[PDB]
Amino acid sequence: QGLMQFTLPVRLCKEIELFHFDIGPFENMWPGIFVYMVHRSCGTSCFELEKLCRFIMSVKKNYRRVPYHNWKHAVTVAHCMYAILQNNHTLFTDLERKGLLIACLCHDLDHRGFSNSYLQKFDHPLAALYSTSTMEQHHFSQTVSILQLEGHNIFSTLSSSEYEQVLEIIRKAIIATDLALYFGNRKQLEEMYQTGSLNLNNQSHRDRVIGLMMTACDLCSVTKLWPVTKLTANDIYAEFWAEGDEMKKLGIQPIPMMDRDKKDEVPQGQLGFYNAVAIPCYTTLTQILPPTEPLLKACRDNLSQWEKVIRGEE
Numbered sequence: 362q363g364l365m366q367f368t369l370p371v372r373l374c375k376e377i378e379l380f381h382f383d384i385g386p387f388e389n390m391w392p393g394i395f396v397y398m399v400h401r402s403c404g405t406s407c408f409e410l411e412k413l414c415r416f417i418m419s420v421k422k423n424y425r426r427v428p429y430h431n432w433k434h435a436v437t438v439a440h441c442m443y444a445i446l447q448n449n450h451t452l453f454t455d456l457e458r459k460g461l462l463i464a465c466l467c468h469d470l471d472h473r474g475f476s477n478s479y480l481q482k483f484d485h486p487l488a489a490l491y492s493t494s495t496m497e498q499h500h501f502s503q504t505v506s507i508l509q510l511e512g513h514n515i516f517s518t519l520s521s522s523e524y525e526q527v528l529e530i531i532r533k534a535i536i537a538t539d540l541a542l543y544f545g546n547r548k549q550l551e552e553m554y555q556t557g558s559l560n561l562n563n564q565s566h567r568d569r570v571i572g573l574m575m576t577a578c579d580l581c582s583v584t585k586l587w588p589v590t591k592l593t594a595n596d597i598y599a600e601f602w603a604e605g606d607e608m609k610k611l612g613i614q615p616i617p618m619m620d621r622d623k624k625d626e627v628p629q630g631q632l633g634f635y636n637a638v639a640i641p642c643y644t645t646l647t648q649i650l651p652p653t654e655p656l657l658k659a660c661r662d663n664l665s666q667w668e669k670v671i672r673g674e675e
């Protein structure tokens with residue numbers, strides 16, 4: 362009865378396999394795109410189509426109308442994870458394929474457009490509930506809520522212990538998108554790869570590798586073609602500046618990336634970000650998963666485009 366196979370137009374069918382695919386401006390195509398990626402990376406029998414569709418639409422409803430941390434970010438992040446899985450298909454378990462696409466879709470659920478810092482300084486109730494990874498623990502709690510709605514248990518064919526494992530994959534993957542945790546996790550993986558101690562059969566080493574994959578997916582907008590990366594940078598900065606305004610309303614001077622008066626210093630901020638965060642991220646990931654090379658290559662090309670802006674040629 363699974364004779365209803367999802368298909369895409371010719372251009373999308375070919376380009377969705379490229380790391381630098383952009384999912385386009387047609388919101389009503391994104392659910393079909395996510396199902397197609399699930400059917401091909403996981404299998405057409407991983408999920409009941411009616412529960413997956415109900416789940417997908419409840420998740421979309423619980424993302425907010427914000428410039429960057431929105432439904433389009435959720436699907437873009439999931440597509441990057443699709444491209445890593447299809448190009449390293451021998452390395453992951455059945456449960457990891459199931460959990461990771463869902464983790465990426467759900468990873469910024471109910472994002473208001475504010476950092477963990479603003480929530481601490483504002484004394485938001487979520488900061489009292491979750492002392493560290495504040496928004497990330499909230500995103501995970503929102504995932505569990507949606508899964509627990511009538512007709513939304515997309516994992517209903519799994520045993521109790523398998524359900525419990527995949528929810529633990531999703532919880533750790535979502536927490537790993539807290540960039541404050543990425544610095545420590547990348548350092549550990551760097552030393553582990555360089556001393557030849559890294560071991561993909563060690564569950565605590567899998568946890569770290571999947572963490573880094575989540576960081577790489579979450580930043581994958583710096584790995585698109587220049588026009589996409591430049592336009593998407595306006596979207597995140599719109600959020601940065603709005604948080605900066607809110608820091609000023611609390612009588613607190615915002616850090617520089619969040620001050621809308623420091624607009625002319627965006628090219629230098631981007632330079633700072635690519636060298637301190639992005640390049641190291643895709644470098645370490647290319648070492649562990651060599652087929653993820655095109656992410657690093659496109660990150661280097663965009664770093665070069667920011668250097669051309671700072672010299673006044675772009």
Ligand SMILES: Cc1nc(Nc2ncc(-c3cccnc3)c3ccc(CO)nc23)cs1
Nearest residue numbers: 580582583590593594597618630631633634
């Ligand atoms: C010290 C500084 N840090 C930043 N932070 C960032 N700048 C830019 C991007 C970005 C987005 C889309 C397209 N191209 C670039 C970005 C994406 C994700 C995150 C994770 O929080 N941070 C980002 C700017 S100055």
Ligand SMILES: [Cl-]
Nearest residue numbers: 424425426427
């Ligand atoms: Cl809203």
Ligand SMILES: [Cl-]
Nearest residue numbers: 425471472473
């Ligand atoms: Cl709110």
Ligand SMILES: [Cl-]
Nearest residue numbers: 511512513514
């Ligand atoms: Cl159910």
Ligand SMILES: [K+]
Nearest residue numbers: 430469538579
């Ligand atoms: K983010």
Ligand SMILES: [Mg+2]
Nearest residue numbers: 468469538539
């Ligand atoms: Mg986040």
Ligand SMILES: [Zn+2]
Nearest residue numbers: 468469538579
């Ligand atoms: Zn994100």
